[PDB]
Amino acid sequence: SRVLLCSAGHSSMVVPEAFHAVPEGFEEVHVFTTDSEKFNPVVLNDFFHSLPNVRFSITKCHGLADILNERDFEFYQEMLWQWYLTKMPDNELPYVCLSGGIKSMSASLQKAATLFGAQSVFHVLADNNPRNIEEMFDALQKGQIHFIEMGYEPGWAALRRLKKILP
Amino acid sequence: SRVLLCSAGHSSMVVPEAFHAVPEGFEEVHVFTTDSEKFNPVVLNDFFHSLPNVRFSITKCHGLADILNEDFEFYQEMLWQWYLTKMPDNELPYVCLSGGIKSMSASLQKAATLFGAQSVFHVLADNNPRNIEEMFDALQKGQIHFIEMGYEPGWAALRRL
RNA sequence: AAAAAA
């Protein structure tokens, strides 16, 4: 049950790229983002509508478009970690791409991966930042997408068990 | 004691904004960044020359400029080495993870989580000051936003020499 | 490579 969890910001192209971090692909892809109006799923909709065997979901941190202070962040992080526990599969650690968002978003998903576990945590760098699916496919033919593996995390079984408190 | 650990990328000005996360500032400032040319230490050197009783240092990941591979077989180990030697020995440091590519911010978060931090935080600036008086203008007009992301107790990894 | 993948 290959599950990719992705943070997104205002560059939705990190998620189709993340999907190609492994040649097999992913059975599930779940994205967490702010609900800023700058967030755009159009490229995400068309891409995954073209992969009908992929369970795809967008989850927003309701009401928070920009993290600017402590309260914002603790709300973001609470809703993120609930999302992580909910979407991570039961008999297998998830794959997590922390590329999208402001730095606090990437760091909070890194910390969640360290707590609950992840088969791999990675980041994607693109020579020319593909703006579209077709330029992404161009870029990975030329080898201009670079996947940075930053480590397996076992997590803690007692922290995964927090999934029991959730609906 | 009262030690700020800061990751830097190609925007050195996150560091003096970080210094102003508290009115008292910090008694030491320690920066870690890659070895690329687009890192400019000059605004940092000029700033901290004006604060002589702050101990300031810059440490680069010698040999590594960009990180493109598995955290390029190198960044994380130097970062964690640097954190332990720079951190206070009987108190936890303050940590600003603002600068760098996402992987270097994420790696400092992880170091904070393992070794402990009094505070982990991030800094947003409306207009991205490029120099000190732009930052002091932004500070005056509420244009710099400090995001406190949380205390980290860390482990007994601190005990490492 | 701080308000959002190098």
Author numbering:
A (entry chain B): 2 to 168
B (entry chain A): 2 to 71, 73 to 163
Paper excerpt:
To further test this finding, we purified a hexa-histidyl-tagged CARF domain (residues 1–185, Cad1-CARF-His6) and tested the binding of different cOAs using isothermal titration calorimetry (ITC). We found that Cad1-CARF-His6 binds to both cA6 and cA4 with a kD of 30 and 700 nM, respectively. We also co-crystallized cA6 and cA4 with Cad1-CARF-His6 and solved the crystal structures at 1.8 and 2.4 Å resolution, respectively. Although both cOA ligands were fully accommodated in the electropositive pocket of apo Cad1-CARF-His6, they affected differently the angle between the two C-terminal legs of the CARF monomers. While cA6 binding produced a minor change (from 58° in the apo structure to 55°), cA4 binding opened this angle to 76°, most likely a consequence of the deep burial of cA4 within the pocket. The Watson-Crick edges of several adenosines of bound cA6 and cA4 form intermolecular hydrogen bonds group of charged residues within the pocket, including K104, that account for the specificity of cOA recognition. We obtained a small but clear peak with the same retention time as cA6, a result that indicates that the hexameric form of the cyclic adenylate is the main ligand of Cad1 in staphylococci.
